[PDB]
Every structure is written in structure tokens, then in C-alpha cells.
Amino acid sequence: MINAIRTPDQRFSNLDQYPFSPNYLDDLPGYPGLRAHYLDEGNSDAEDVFLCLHGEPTWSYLYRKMIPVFAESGARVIAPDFFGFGKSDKPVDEEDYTFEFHRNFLLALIERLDLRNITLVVQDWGGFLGLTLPMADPSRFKRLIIMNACLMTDPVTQPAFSAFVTQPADGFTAWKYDLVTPSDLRLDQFMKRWAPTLTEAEASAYAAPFPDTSYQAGVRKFPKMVAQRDQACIDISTEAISFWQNDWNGQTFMAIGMKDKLLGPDVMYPMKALINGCPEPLEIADAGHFVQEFGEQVAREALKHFAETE
Known part of the structure; x- marks a missing residue:
């Protein structure tokens, strides 16, 4: 087992606008002894599944x-x-x-x-x-x-x-x-x-997930991995570019948080060009790095874009 700790459930008692019931997977292959939480919302037998992945230093709350x-x-x-x-x-x-x-x-x-x-x-x-x-x-x-x-x-x-x-x-x-x-x-x-x-x-x-610094090892490591990229990361990421450029033929929707000092237009336009069929981005003037905080607009507009070419 990897040495790990678990945030007490009482830390999540008073969350603002997070009425989503917890689901857990423990002992995923390669992760023995570790319990992962995920939300599973909407019709379980739906044809479409939106897989929403968070970043640093957030969680599905985002x-x-x-x-x-x-x-x-x-x-x-x-x-x-x-x-x-x-x-x-x-x-x-x-x-x-x-x-x-x-x-x-x-x-x-x-x-x-x-x-x-x-x-x-x-x-x-x-x-x-x-x-x-x-x-x-x-x-x-x-x-x-x-x-x-x-x-x-x-x-x-x-x-x-x-x-x-x-x-x-x-x-x-x-x-x-x-x-x-x-x-x-x-x-x-x-x-x-x-x-x-x-x-x-x-x-x-x-802050809820992190009672103290002992719970923040993952939080500390993410930015270090942005600055220092291992060979596996480089190779996999480079292969991914070829996929989006040459192989991808799915529907795509892009939204940019225009106040982001990290991954704004100077990163997202180059990214747009690499994704085959990616349309003109929705520019959200007021949004920063955490675009999901202006996410109702993104979700609504993406659904309309997708309905347009089902």
C-alpha cells in the first residue's frame, strides 16, 4: 500500500451548493488500499457521459x-x-x-x-x-x-x-x-x-479537504510537475498532440477565461489549432483560471453547440 490518509467526513458537513451524493471506488487496480471519491449524477443509463476532471488545487466542487x-x-x-x-x-x-x-x-x-x-x-x-x-x-x-x-x-x-x-x-x-x-x-x-x-x-x-499540511502532499506536487516534467509525461503529452491533430474527429467546444495569467489566450489559441475541428473559442471576459466558476454559461453553450451537430 501507498501511505495515505483520509479527510474526516465532518469537514464536508457545511458545503455551499454541493448537494451531490458521494460514490467511492476502493482498490482500483494499481491503487490498493486507496479510496477514490466521484460524483455520478443524472440518468445512470444515459447514452452520454460528461467526465469532468478538476485541476490544482481543487476538486469536484469546482x-x-x-x-x-x-x-x-x-x-x-x-x-x-x-x-x-x-x-x-x-x-x-x-x-x-x-x-x-x-x-x-x-x-x-x-x-x-x-x-x-x-x-x-x-x-x-x-x-x-x-x-x-x-x-x-x-x-x-x-x-x-x-x-x-x-x-x-x-x-x-x-x-x-x-x-x-x-x-x-x-x-x-x-x-x-x-x-x-x-x-x-x-x-x-x-x-x-x-x-x-x-x-x-x-x-x-x-479548504475543506485539508485539515492540515499533512493532507496537502498532492497539492504541493502538482505545480512542481508543471515546472519539472518527467520523460514519461513529455512522451505521453507529445503523443497526445498527434492524436488531437491527426486522429480526433469528435465534437469540440472551447471556452477561455480571459483574465487567466497562466493558461489564457497565449496558451489556448495554440491549443485550438492543434485540436482538429476545434471551433472559435467562447471568450469569457470576467473568468480567470477557474473557468468553471463561470461554468453555467460554458455548460449551456457547449450543449447548444453539441445539439447543433449531433
């Missing part, structure tokens, strides 16, 4: 405005919390978190739930990882909703997907500094800074 919109369209919605996050178990050592640790978890979850007709919904690490899934099992994937995200390839193959790491100083550089440096990391305060439109109660929901 999708709370989108889930009801997708479910009311008649689709199923699966929103897992990565190990280290949300209501999932949390390995205590940063060394146990790797790109493939997280990627293989998603593949295991997809196989375990036998998800098909997937609309992949991604942002940040949900995208860095999620965008590498379809090439592993392409017949399971039907559509893509992409918000502020890209692929963790090397600087030479796609400079746009590395330049943001070092400029602007107040972008990823500040984000990483905020996450990896404090001994007492307060994610409510972090999230209010990086999503300034959050209410206090919403911000508290992002």
Missing part, C-alpha cells in the same frame, strides 16, 4: 455549477476527485504523486465504470492529464469541452506550453510560489486570490 446543467440535458455526469484531493484518499509523500500515477488512475476509473460515449470536460491538470486519455482508448470518447488547459510537452515542441512557467512573474510563478512555499497553506485564501469572485463559503469549500 464543477458544481456545471453538473446540474449537464444532468438536466439527460446525460450522466462523472466527476472524480484525484487522489490527494476532495474526498479521495491522500498519499502523504510527494514522491508518490507522478504524472502517470494520476493518469493511470483515470484510465482505471474509466475501465471500472465502463464509461463510453464520453464528453471529456477539462481544465488545468484535468486537461494536462485528461487530454492524454482518448488515444489510449479512442472508441470511448465522443466529445471534448476544453477550458484553460494544454499539454505538458517539452519547450521545443510547443514553446507556448512552457513559456507561461517563467513569465509573467505574477502568473504561474506567483501561483507556484503561493502553493509550495507556505508551511501553513490556506487554500481558502489561495482560492479567493486566484478566483476573486468566490464567496467566503465557496472559498471555504476548497
